[PDB]
Nucleic acid binder design. Structure first.
Ligand SMILES: [Mg+2]
Ligand SMILES: [Mg+2]
Ligand code: NA
Length: 327
DNA sequence: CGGCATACG
DNA sequence: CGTAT
DNA sequence: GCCG
């Protein structure tokens, strides 16, 4: 009943196995901190299966036949069901490695490889990194300076304000250009760690060179605390607050209208959903999918899409609205 | 055992 | 290397 | 870690 790919089943934002999925995603995260991408994927997939179930898992037998549940993930669920706690998961939670790798990788500009190297050098805290800025990039200096604000969840109320100011700058950079909210908020999330916008123009070609014009105007308005021709911009915005302001991460992306459906789909996520979707496309349909298009390698042609619905149809998948892509 | 998504800055 | 879903 |  439960299909093997996450793109084949609706996954709502809230579900009936929150505790179980959160435990497996701890192990997925820890696997990533050790470079085990395969293990991370299995744990992520197993967690997502539980998100797609219609009711709580209460007995171990209810895992039989579910894809991506083998000896390891089943044993985690078993201990949680019997004792409300999984020893392996708790061991990871309190490990010095896990805590520090999580703290470091959540810095903007710091990846697993950088965090791992710093950990091997004996570094453990944010103040450790501040004491030696000689080893920090300009991006990492920005992420570290703003780390506190960036750890504060972005609210849906904040998003509307940002979209307004982005549209204002986009409108002056290219009259007629549109701004579309993507990312987790388009999937219905009420909070997020950043805001994701997709920019296009209904006249193919007019979007060329647009993002530098948008960025220059945003900076001149004093709204850019940090930014790097280009089509993706990873910014830190100055977001007004009552009597003050806070730093917020904002991603801006431009696509020509011909590619807009593919870019909307990819940037709406979830991350797991897109990986599963591209995996499904290649392995089950022999088609190559990315945020630019869908390629048939046999005929050497690109599928034209006018909508996300078109893309699901060309992949033989039932359509899923953004709110059901929370894999 | 091979594979595990796929881009851009 | 970082970033993004 | 799990699937095919
Ligand atoms: Mg986001
Ligand atoms: Mg983002
Ligand atoms: Na990071």
């Amino acid at each position: 009943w439960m299909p093997a790919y996450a793109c084949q089943r609706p996954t709502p934002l809230t579900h009936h196995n929150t505790g179980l999925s959160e435990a497996l995603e701890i192990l997925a995260e820890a696997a990533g901190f050790e470079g085990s991408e395969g293990r991370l994927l299995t744990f992520c997939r197993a967690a997502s299966v539980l998100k797609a179930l219609p009711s709580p898992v209460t007995t171990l037998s209810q895992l039989q036949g579910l894809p991506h549940f083998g000896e390891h993930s089943s044993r985690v669920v078993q201990e949680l069901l019997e004792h409300g706690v999984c020893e392996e998961v708790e061991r990871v939670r309190r490990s010095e490695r896990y805590q520090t790798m999580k703290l470091f990788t959540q810095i903007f500009g710091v990846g697993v490889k950088t965090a791992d190297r710093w950990y091997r050098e004996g570094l453990r805290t944010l103040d450790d990194l501040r004491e030696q800025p000689q080893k920090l990039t300009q991006q990492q200096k920005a992420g570290l300076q703003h780390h506190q604000d960036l750890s504060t969840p972005v609210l849906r109320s904040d998003v509307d304000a940002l979209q307004q100011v982005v549209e204002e700058a986009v409108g002056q950079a290219l009259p007629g250009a549109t701004v579309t909210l993507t990312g987790g908020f388009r999937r219905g999330k009420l909070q997020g760690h950043d805001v994701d916008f997709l920019i296009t123009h209904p006249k193919e070609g007019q979007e060329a060179g647009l993002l530098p014009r948008v960025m220059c105007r945003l900076q001149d308005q004093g709204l850019i605390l940090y930014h790097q021709a280009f089509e993706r911009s990873f910014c830190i915005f100055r977001l007004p607050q009552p009597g003050s302001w806070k730093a917020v991460r904002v991603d801006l992306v431009v696509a020509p209208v011909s590619q807009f459906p593919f870019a909307l789909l990819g940037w709406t996520g979830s991350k797991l959903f897109q990986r599963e979707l591209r995996r499904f496309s290649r392995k089950e349909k022999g088609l190559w999918l990315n945020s630019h298009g869908l390629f048939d390698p046999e005929q050497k042609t690109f599928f034209q899409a006018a909508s996300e619905e078109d893309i699901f149809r060309h992949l033989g998948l039932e359509y899923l609205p953004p709110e059901q892509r929370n894999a």
